[PDB]
Every structure is written in C-alpha cells, then in structure tokens.
Design a protein around this ligand. Sequence first.
Ligand SMILES: OC[C@H]1O[C@H](O)[C@H](O)[C@@H](O)[C@@H]1O
Ligand SMILES: OC[C@H]1O[C@H](O)[C@H](O)[C@@H](O)[C@@H]1O
Ligand SMILES: OC[C@H]1O[C@H](O)[C@H](O)[C@@H](O)[C@@H]1O
Ligand SMILES: OC[C@H]1O[C@H](O)[C@H](O)[C@@H](O)[C@@H]1O
Ligand SMILES: [Mg+2]
Ligand SMILES: [Mg+2]
Ligand SMILES: [Mg+2]
Ligand SMILES: [Mg+2]
Ligand SMILES: [Mg+2]
Ligand SMILES: [Mg+2]
Ligand SMILES: [Mg+2]
Ligand SMILES: [Mg+2]
Ligand SMILES: [Mg+2]
Ligand SMILES: [Mg+2]
Ligand SMILES: [Mg+2]
Ligand SMILES: [Mg+2]
Lengths: 386, 386, 386, 386
Amino acid sequence: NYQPTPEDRFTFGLWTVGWQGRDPFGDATRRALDPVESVRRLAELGAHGVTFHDDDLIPFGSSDSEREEHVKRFRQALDDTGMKVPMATTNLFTHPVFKDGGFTANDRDVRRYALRKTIRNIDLAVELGAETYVAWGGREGAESGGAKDVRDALDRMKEAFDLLGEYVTSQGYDIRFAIEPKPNEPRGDILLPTVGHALAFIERLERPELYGVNPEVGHEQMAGLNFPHGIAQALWAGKLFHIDLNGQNGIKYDQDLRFGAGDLRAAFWLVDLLESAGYSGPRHFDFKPPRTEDFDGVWASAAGCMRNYLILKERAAAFRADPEVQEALRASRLDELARPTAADGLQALLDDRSAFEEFDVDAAAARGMAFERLDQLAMDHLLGAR
Amino acid sequence: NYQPTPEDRFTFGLWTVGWQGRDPFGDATRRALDPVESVRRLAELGAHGVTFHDDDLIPFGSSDSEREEHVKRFRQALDDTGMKVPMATTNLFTHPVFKDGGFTANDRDVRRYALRKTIRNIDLAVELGAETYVAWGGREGAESGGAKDVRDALDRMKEAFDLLGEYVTSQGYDIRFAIEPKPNEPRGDILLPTVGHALAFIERLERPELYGVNPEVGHEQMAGLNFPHGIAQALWAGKLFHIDLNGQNGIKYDQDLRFGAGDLRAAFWLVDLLESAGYSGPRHFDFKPPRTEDFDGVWASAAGCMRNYLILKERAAAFRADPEVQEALRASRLDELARPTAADGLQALLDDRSAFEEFDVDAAAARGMAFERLDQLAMDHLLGAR
Amino acid sequence: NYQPTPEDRFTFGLWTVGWQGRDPFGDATRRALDPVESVRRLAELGAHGVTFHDDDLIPFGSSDSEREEHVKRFRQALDDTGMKVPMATTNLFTHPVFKDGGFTANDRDVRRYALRKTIRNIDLAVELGAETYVAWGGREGAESGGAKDVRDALDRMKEAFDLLGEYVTSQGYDIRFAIEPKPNEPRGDILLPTVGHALAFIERLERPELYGVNPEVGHEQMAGLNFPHGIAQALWAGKLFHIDLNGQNGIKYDQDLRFGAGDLRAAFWLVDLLESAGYSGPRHFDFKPPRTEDFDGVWASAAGCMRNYLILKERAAAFRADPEVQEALRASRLDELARPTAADGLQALLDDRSAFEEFDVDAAAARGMAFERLDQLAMDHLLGAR
Amino acid sequence: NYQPTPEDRFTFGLWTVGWQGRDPFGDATRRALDPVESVRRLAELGAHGVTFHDDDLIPFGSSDSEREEHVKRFRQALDDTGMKVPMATTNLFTHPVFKDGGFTANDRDVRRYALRKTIRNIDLAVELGAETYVAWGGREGAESGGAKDVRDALDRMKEAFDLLGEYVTSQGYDIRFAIEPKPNEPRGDILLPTVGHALAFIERLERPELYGVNPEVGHEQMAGLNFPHGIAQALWAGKLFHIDLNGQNGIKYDQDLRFGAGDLRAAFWLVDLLESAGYSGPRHFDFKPPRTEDFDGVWASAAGCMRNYLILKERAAAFRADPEVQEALRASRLDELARPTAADGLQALLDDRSAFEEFDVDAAAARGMAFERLDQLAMDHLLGAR
Ligand SMILES: OC[C@H]1O[C@H](O)[C@H](O)[C@@H](O)[C@@H]1O
Ligand SMILES: OC[C@H]1O[C@H](O)[C@H](O)[C@@H](O)[C@@H]1O
Ligand SMILES: OC[C@H]1O[C@H](O)[C@H](O)[C@@H](O)[C@@H]1O
Ligand SMILES: OC[C@H]1O[C@H](O)[C@H](O)[C@@H](O)[C@@H]1O
Ligand SMILES: [Mg+2]
Ligand SMILES: [Mg+2]
Ligand SMILES: [Mg+2]
Ligand SMILES: [Mg+2]
Ligand SMILES: [Mg+2]
Ligand SMILES: [Mg+2]
Ligand SMILES: [Mg+2]
Ligand SMILES: [Mg+2]
Ligand SMILES: [Mg+2]
Ligand SMILES: [Mg+2]
Ligand SMILES: [Mg+2]
Ligand SMILES: [Mg+2]
C-alpha cells in the first residue's frame, strides 16, 4: 500500500523538513533540526537521499576547523543510514550582502564573492558525491525598472555560469549544473522567470551541454503556466536534469505545499509524463511543512509527499495500460500526431493537391476530436472509479 | 505636440481598426471596414504602414481571380498613400478546420493544409514587400492533459518551421520569421506560452538565424511577467524582429487595449528600452478599439496609440539626459553592473583574497542601493514633475 | 456505478450543450441545437431540468405569435419528458444595444428597455414554474476609469433590482432573485465582481429577503479566491439560492469546463460542503463543451458533469463517515472551533485570569494542529486509497 | 512643488519605515528604529501622524512598569512634534500562539487570549486619541480544506467583533472598528478576502454602525480586482472608515511598494475618487521600503509616498476642471448615468411604449459611447501633456 523504498529515488532538502516556520509575518514555530537527525528520520521513512545548501550544513561564518567537524558528522550519518547526496546548491539569498543579488548584484565585489562562495561548495558537493549542482538565483532581479539594466545583468549571469563551467572542466569534476527558475519572490521580478527563459539562456553559454534546468511545480504555476507542458519542453530539449516537486494553489506567494496538494490533476499528468519518458533522476521534494504543524506533522507531511507520488504513479500506469484508453487515444488521433507531417519532403507537399486544391476543408472540420471522452477516462482512473 | 509621421514607423494590423466588436458574449457593434478605407484613414493619421492576415485581405474561399482583384485594389491604395506593408501573417485559427491547431493538429491532413495555406501567403507577403512573417499559433495547445503529447507536438512544430525555412531559402526570399507567444486563449494552454519558451524553441530549428520573436505586451502580462525584462532578453539574444504594442490590465483575458493603457509604468520602461537599444523595426499596434466605440472612437483610439508612444519617448529621453538621473545611476552602481565580474580570469579570481578570505561582508551589506530615489526620479519624469 | 436520476436535481442551461463553439478567435464548429432536442437528450442522460435565457428560447425580435409557438413546442417537450424548469434568466449582454450594460448603461433609455425586457421574461419564467430568477450583469462594468461613476452605477443597479422586487410582490409571484457575480470578461472589470460584493449589495436593497447569490465555480476562481470558502459565507448568510457548477484552470479567461475538471480538490471540498449543509437547490451546470468536440462529445461532456459530482459525493461521504477521520477532526480541534469563545459573556472574560494574566502562551504555541495528517486522509479518500 | 503639510493628513505605521527587511528568504538588512526617532523623522517630512500595533510600541512580554515607560516616552515625542495617532491595531499574527489565527483559532483558549490582548490595546488607543481601531485577521484562514469549517469560523469571528462592540459601548468610548481584508498570505486563503466579503460580514454584526472597512490598494490587487471600484462600493455603503495606500505589481506576494508605484493609472483614479467624494479620513501609507535600501532610502521612499499623492491630486483636479473633459463627460452620458432610470415609477414604466414596443433598438445600438476619447484626455492630464 504505497510504501516508498530507496529504489524510488525520493530525496528531500535539509531546508524542507528543517524549515522552522518563520514567514514574513511571524516568528518560528518549531525549533531547529540537527541535520544528522533529519538524515536519520528521512531514512526511516524510505527516502533515498538528501540535498543541502552550503549554509544548511555549515553555519555561515564557520572556521575551517568547525567546517570539517560539520562535514564529518554529516558523512557519518550518511554512512550509518545508506543515504545519498545527489544534489547540492549554494545559499546566495539569505545573507544581507546578497540583497541585490549574487551573480548579478550591481556591486562588482559582491559578484566576485558570490562566485567564490559557490566554487567552495562545488568542491564539497563533489566530495559528497553530488551529481547535480543547482543554482536558484532568488535575489537576481529588481523591484523597479531603473535599478537593473537587464542586458548587462544577463551578461553578468552568463559570465558567472561560464566561469563555473570553466572551473568544473579544469578540475575534471563529473557534475552538471541545473538552473531553477522562479518568476518572482523575494524580488519583485526575478531574472530567468520560467523554464523557457532558462532554456533559452543556456543556449548562449560557452559550454551548453553542462547546463540544464531544475523546474519546480509551484514556480511555473505562480505564472499560471502548465507545468507538465513546461517539463515536456525541457525533456524535448534534453535538459531535464533534476526536478523540484511540491504543490501550489494558483497565482500567489510560493506556498511549497507537499506534493499532491495544490493542482492534483497537474500532479497526475506530471507523474504520467515523468514515468512514460523514463526520467531517471531524483524525485526531489522542495516543500515546507506548514507552520501550524509540530514535529509529528513535519514527518507526516514528508511521508505524504512520497505516498502521493506512488498513488499517482499507479493510477497513471493503469490509465495507459487500459485497452479502452488505448482505443480512445487512437480515436483522438494521438497516433497521427506522432507521425511526420511531410516525410515526403517540401516538393512533394507542394505538388500534393490533396493537401490544398482538393482538400475537403468542411469534412475535416466536422470531425470531432473526442477529447472529452478521453479526459473523463483519465478522471475515472485518477479517482479509482476504474 | 506629439504628432506622428511615417518616419516614426507606426504600423497597424488591418484586423485592429477593423475589429467589428464580436466577443464571446456579444454580436458585432460595428460594420466591416473595407481594407482600402482602413489604409487611407491610417495614412491620414500618420501611420507608416499596415499588416494583414491572408484572410483579412482575401476572403476565405476566394477564386484565384477574385484573389487577384483583392490584391490589385489593395496595392492601388498603398501606391496612392505611400503606406508600406512590413509584416504579414497567416490566419490559422478562425476556420473550424483549425479547431485543434494548424501546425500541431492531431490530424495529419490538417497539418499539411496549414503548411500549404501558409506558403501561399508567404509568396504574397514577399510580393507586397513584407520583411517579417509572423506566426501566432493561437490554436496550438489543449484544454486537457491527454489530448496532446507535447513532445510530439513540438516535433511537429519544429517540422513545420523547418519546412518554411527550407521554402524561403530555396526561393531566395529575403524574409524572416517571428514567432508570437501567448500563454492561453483561445486554447486552455498554448504551446510556446512566453518569450522565453519561444526563444528556446528557435535554438532547436535547423536554421535558427531565420527565426526570432514577435512579443506582445499584453501576452506576457497575462502570465504576470515583466514585459520590458522579456524584451531585454530577446534583444540580448539578437532575436527581437518585431513587436506588438498594446495594453493589458493584469492576468485575465487578452484585452488588447490601446498602447499606454494598462500598465503605464511598464509602457514607460518599454519605450526607454526600445529607444536606448536602437530598435529599428516597426512599432506595431495589435489592439482592439473597445466595442463601446463607433467609428470616430476607432480612429481616436488608434491615434491615442501613437500619441502615447511619442509622449513616453519624450519622457524617457528626458529621464536619461537629466544630470541628476545620471548621478543617481552611478549612486546605485549601474555603471558597475556593466563592468565584467572577472576579466582577470578564473585563476586570478581564485587567488584574490579580497574576493573571499578578506572580503568585508558586513561593510558591503550595509551599503544602500539607493533604488527608491532613482525610481522616484523616474516617476517625476514620467509625470512631468521634472 | 454513478448513474444520475432526476432525484439528484441536475440541471443544464440550454446555452451550455447548445453552445456552437464561437469564441473571440473562431467561427462556430457545431450547428445550432433545437431546444426541444436538447430537452429530450438531457432527459435521456438523467437530468432533472433545464434553464434558459429569454433569447435562447424565443429568437430576438420574434412577433408575439411566433413567441407563443416557441413556448408551446417547448412546453410540449417538458410534458413529454417530465423535465422541470427551475431557473430562468434574461439575456442582457448579446445584443449591441447592451454594449455599455443593461441596468447600468449610461443611456437612460437603454436602462428602461433592459428593465422591460427582464419583466417580460419574469412573467414567462413564472408560467413555466421557475423558482429562481438569475441576473448576471455581464455588461455592467467598464474598460476605463472615467467611463463609469461607480457610485451612480450602484444607485442605478439598486434602482433596477428594487423595481423588479416591487414588480414580483405586486403580481404576487413566488419567485426569488439570485445575482451571479463575475470579476471580468466581457467587460474589463464587472460591477459586483465576487460573491462578497454581491452579498454586501443585497443588504442595501429595499427587500433583501427576495435576493440571494448564484455563485459560479469558475468566476470566483478567476479572482484566485477559494470557492468553497465563498459558498460557506453565502450559506452562513442564508443567501445561497442557486449555484453554477463547472471547472476552471486558474486566473485566465472564463473556461467553463465540465464540472470536476479544473481544480479537482476544490470540487471535492465544494461537494462535501453542499452535501453536509443540506443544500437542496438545483445542481446546475453552466459549462461549455469544448469546440474541439462534435455532438457525441457534447453529450459525453454533459454526462461527465453529473458523473463527477456523484463520484465526489461518494468520496466526501466516505471521508466524513470514516472513524479515523472523525478522530483526526478532534485531534485538530474542529470540535472546539464550533464551541462559543465566550458564552460566559464579556464581564466573565475580563475577570478570567486564565485568558490572559495566567495564560501559558508558550505551551499553547507548541501544540501542533495536526492539519497535514487530516489533509492526507482527505487525499486518500478522494483517490480511493481508502 | 508638492510639499506635504500636516493638513494633508498623511500618516504612517511605525512598522512601515521601521521594517527591518526580513523576508521569507533573508535576514534583516537594517537595524531596528526606536519609535521615538520614527515619530521625529516623520514629523520633519510633513507627516500628520503615526499608527501602531500594540507590539510595535510595547515589546511582547513587557511588565506593566515597562509598559508605562514605553507609553510615556512615546507620548513625549508626540507632544514634542505635534504628531497625532488616529489609528491603532493589534498584532494577532506574529507570535507562534497565533499560528492558526486569533479570533478564529481552533483552540478556544487562544481565541479568548486574542480577545483579551485586543481589549487591552483598545484602552491604550483611546488614551492616545485614536479614532479608528483596525483589525487585520492575517492568520484567520487555512492551507487545507478540512482544517477550518468556515461557517463555524464566521460564527467565531462574529462573536469576537460583537464582544468588542459590546466592550466599547459599555465603556463609552468614541472609537470605531475597520476590518482590513486580504485574500491570502500568510495563510493559503484568508477569511473575508476582499472588500466585498468584509462589507457583507459587517451587515450581520449586532451593531453594524460601529464597523467599516480599511481596504488596502495592494490587497485587492492581489485578487486582480479594480481597487477604485471597490472603494466606490465602500463609499456607497457609507463604510470607508480608513484606507491603506501603497503599490502592488499585479497578482503575486504582497509587495507593499510605496504609493504611486505599481499600478499608476489605478492610483490616479483612486485619488480622483477620494478627493471628489470628500473622503476626510487619514491618508495612511502601509508600505515597506525595499530591503535594498539603507536609512536614507527609507526616508526617500516615505517622502515619495506623499509626493506621489500630491502630484496625482493636482492632475486629477485639473482633469475634472478642464472644460474639454466636462464636455466629453456629457458626450459619454455620464450625466445620464446620474439620473434615475424610472423616477416615474413601475406602473409608468410598464405603460411607456417608448421603453419597449416602440423603442428603436438599432438606433440606440449605433450610438458610440466616446469612452476612448475621454480616456485619452485622462491620460493626457496624468502625463502633463495638458
Ligand atoms: O536552490 C535550492 C533551493 O533554495 C531555496 O530554498 C529556494 O527557495 C528553492 O526554491 C530552491 O530550490
Ligand atoms: O498573428 C498576428 C495576430 O493574429 C491574431 O489576430 C492574434 O490575436 C494576434 O495576437 C496576432 O498578433
Ligand atoms: O445568466 C445566466 C448565464 O448567462 C451567461 O451565459 C453567462 O455567461 C453565465 O455565466 C450566466 O450564468
Ligand atoms: O493591521 C495593520 C497592519 O498589520 C500588518 O502589518 C499587515 O501586514 C497590514 O496589512 C495591516 O494593515
Ligand atoms: Mg517554491
Ligand atoms: Mg521554491
Ligand atoms: Mg525549489
Ligand atoms: Mg493580444
Ligand atoms: Mg494578441
Ligand atoms: Mg499580437
Ligand atoms: Mg463562466
Ligand atoms: Mg460563467
Ligand atoms: Mg454562470
Ligand atoms: Mg499589504
Ligand atoms: Mg498589507
Ligand atoms: Mg494594511
């Protein structure tokens, strides 16, 4: 009955179950968790691994000797539990120095500091075995129009990622980068606000094959966009390196609800897509147990993330295996969508009079697409009414 | 006092001033305009040129002989007035045959028909002197998740644009393509919903240099995105081939208000950016005079589009020329944003102890950015209080 | 297996299954349905009744003799099928005369005409047995700020509804009015945009007991509001006279998807609320079969509306009957929410030192609310994983 | 040149200029301000007065003797500067005990504590001369459907406000209450989410004349609603007791930008309305200087709030005084909107054949409303191009 195992590759950020509940209007409602206890608790729930910002693991300002002590304790908990660390990232948003951004801060000395803080953590990530290094530029942006020349900012952003790519290739590291877009919050508008803007930007980097995207369910939904469509475009481009799963109720602040909450039907189509495209990366939950909860609610919320993925996986697999659905997909011509429009080539298309001169536009127009029957079959499967 | 001339390159679609006022809840409130009278009226107002869909100019279903008569009348009005036709496009959305799309319809025969209808109009556009050919895939999309495999749809979309590019290069035509994104309406979700998704898609075409974007103010704002930021990214990529100007009040149906209505401060920053980047393409208005108006209101609304652009152009130029603003831009370190982060290279950055070991993070954090004073100077200029 | 019967009180507007598929960018994809055939087809599917605008039933402009012929044919189909007509409404939005509104048009003669057209249909509605008369002011609004003084418009709106109330009471009719709010579309902003604004307005009418609300799922969601919360407020006020059920994916144009599509979890909480509050009015579907569909898709979409309501009704009833859920509701103190805060009165509260001086704020703060476990039980029930 | 004086009645919350810059992703960027220094600085800028939460003035947990010391220092700064305190409010959102709300917390003992904490501050407010007591129920709400029975919550909310009203009338205090709506943040959905919902709720209180609304520009815009329309409805009801002015760019997190930023044209229509309706309450700024700013930017941002109000006031007054605008208002029949539809009464309307039988619907339909010319005159005035 929907029990996770480490083979399902579910991972969690230390900052998710460790969120103390401080929001812009209220104090923390929970005490801080020791990273070691989070690793142990998540292993008991069936998680595969954890992820971290540098500052989640090593408190800002630590001497190099305290740094080594923090890493050693952490490594011991990984060894004790079998937990992996597939992804790491840099905190370039909490400290006041980053108030105008990290890579695109107007102050050049802050931009250099941001790069040095990142490189330091790339080394640590590689040491712990991370395969993906995520960058969320949460402070790269503006509240007003004149504060940021965006063309210069994009030059500075390209400069920073190119330097990171030069660094990992010169060190011989097997790590790739994933850019995580978000349209706004905490800045009024954030640079590279959606999956598409991030994909387009990567194509202008010096070594584009090193960079992909880490889309988050709730972030694309904060722009009212269709998250499974955006994932499909990322898979089509070959760039889905990692994914952040959670829930979001529409266009408002970033709620980071547990996965399956928010838009349930979008969650169903997302799982259907990830499973049928053979996505094999981590299923990472970037979520925040609501600040109404005590510690038992934190672990129930985390367990719910995994449970909902596994239920949706079962319902999507049943949907695609149902002969009646396979019939309906052909009735709606999904098979014809997958066939080339003009494999016969341009010249044959131009001479083909059934494509224009003799095309019966009124007969083609009358054909129904039968999409509503297909979508009700999908609803019946999601709800277990089939 | 803000009088346009053809040197300002203002253009209008035939379908804008010709919109009869039919909306999803109501009949037309205005009679149809003859394209010839629209060209004459727009020339009197100071417009530079007009744009058209094939079906605006040649009623759907016309015999080749009626086609020639429509083009000849149109060409005579252009000659009589001096009006240009810089852009043309295809209607792949009104006729019922296109109800599931044109290039990405599930039915293969509709996709072939869509391509033939487009190619036919590309020839006409070239004959009339158009330099840009726009594609707005308004029906490419879905209302439900199972109706459209988006990876196959993107294959079909790439297939169609690659064929169009093969066609124009084999004919030797000097015309480029611009993809116009829109996130939704009339489909529940439209493929390539934003500037960024369109930019990313173009990089996967066989001949990317032939394709750019035609962003529309209101369309990016229907996803709550910052339109001047998205334009900056398109300019940075070298892809801003054309632009649709209008107004939109936030996230709702596509209002297509006259330019300057909707988000006035975004209009100001857009004009500032287009003028300071030296955009030299048409300033095209894709707007709809509200259906409350009679024909005198149609021409007042069209005149307002141009008037508002010219007022904003004057206020943006004054803002950038004001020595106090130039001082404030330096106070906020816009100059430093334009300087490379690490022209000294990766190795120098790694050995630079002022970038990390000796960086005074608390001193840098205390520096104010002075953005609010800059933004109030921008407000004062917009309002003519300077 | 989720078969409707007329006892479930499902009703449909003639304009829903009869929508021809004309949207702002495209022609009709389906021929017009005879109202008589819609009544027969809906009776076969298990519907309880139908609703109509005057202009759905009697084509605009009909002579009084054609009017009588249309009503007689309609009445015969009702008799033949047993279908009821519980609600009727007036079309004050399609004809061009209504382009600036009906009750709040700036032109006084249009406002008088709007009232006469309404009164005429109130008589017909009463004759056919309607119990509720709906008013959707779709054209009452503005695209620009100076076009409409809203205080004067609200005076005109109060004037119109007061006259309608004087009319029904002077005729001795047993009919009540329900105002249907919508925030925008087709006007840029519509007056009384949400349930709350409509409830507040009713309290200023001369005879408030005659007026309630007819909320629509998709309309409150076009403002990003929680529809079950808004229904709860309407029930709390005693004003939920009627309801329009459908589906909507977030903040965009009014999609009018079949009920159960859009926000599925909101549909679940809505059904839970209607059923547990004992709402006994019609379950009315105001939806539009997508224009991709032929006539078989129209009836499948209509059947899906009812099927989804009945599935959700079953899952909500199971949720509330589950002893584990009843336990969890007490764990989250839903029982305590239902108990008065201070039945002991103001003076006892002021003298109660356990309410302030001796209140242990830190102990109360540490208590978890256990909401995530409750919400996962609700998810499990919705998905049939319980 | 747009210099404020205390006669303009501009007020500021202590928490606005005192916001330290802590957001959900970052630490404070500014040190705390002493309330005494904020009062002095705001008096120098031309403010009329300040407002406070209990916890802004008296740190949570203070002994009664420290309480008296805080009030005395504060009162001395008011005396020294001439600053007034027209409004006060209660912090029922920051402390963890309020994580599930104050008046509608599920735990009864928290609800009693919330009431006692409020009553204590009502006494203080009266002592300092406040005329309005604001309630913003920021924690009254839910993230999930089963956590909160909204009908019971509204019972608890009515219970709390009725008790407050019994308290002020039994003490003989001349103070009125204003409810401040907000649709979401920090809860997933907040009870009474808009002006309309708050107006409707007040009509069910035992003593409705004691309660009005305190709408905030940005909060109604977070639901995509037209703020000047919502203010007009509040004025029409006689309930606009207070107003929070600021700026907001569309549907996203609550930005609290300085007034005039965000939607500039909505700011213009708001000022036009407040000034022409003779609103005489405080012009209160609930805004947050962005966390990019140092203390000089804080005071520049505060000064900008007042400057923008005064510029907009001048442009709106010029607009309404312009004879050409007065002509255009008559051309668009704003005069006719203000005249009763049917002062002749119901029976005369029914016998008036020019209202229906002989009404020339096609002639009335052809009349243009001339709204676009009016709106361009309004644009010209806003921009100082007239
Ligand atoms: O970069 C990793 C994470 O960092 C921050 O916590 C962001 O809020 C989250 O969206 C992001 O995924
Ligand atoms: O493709 C050209 C135009 O066609 C349609 O009219 C669209 O509504 C508009 O957005 C687009 O720019
Ligand atoms: O007034 C009844 C109906 O009329 C119109 O069709 C509206 O679009 C719908 O929302 C409303 O319910
Ligand atoms: O209640 C007074 C104020 O308290 C809080 O600071 C809210 O964020 C603000 O919206 C409200 O006006
Ligand atoms: Mg997030
Ligand atoms: Mg996130
Ligand atoms: Mg994330
Ligand atoms: Mg548009
Ligand atoms: Mg458009
Ligand atoms: Mg366009
Ligand atoms: Mg609707
Ligand atoms: Mg509707
Ligand atoms: Mg409806
Ligand atoms: Mg706010
Ligand atoms: Mg606020
Ligand atoms: Mg406020």
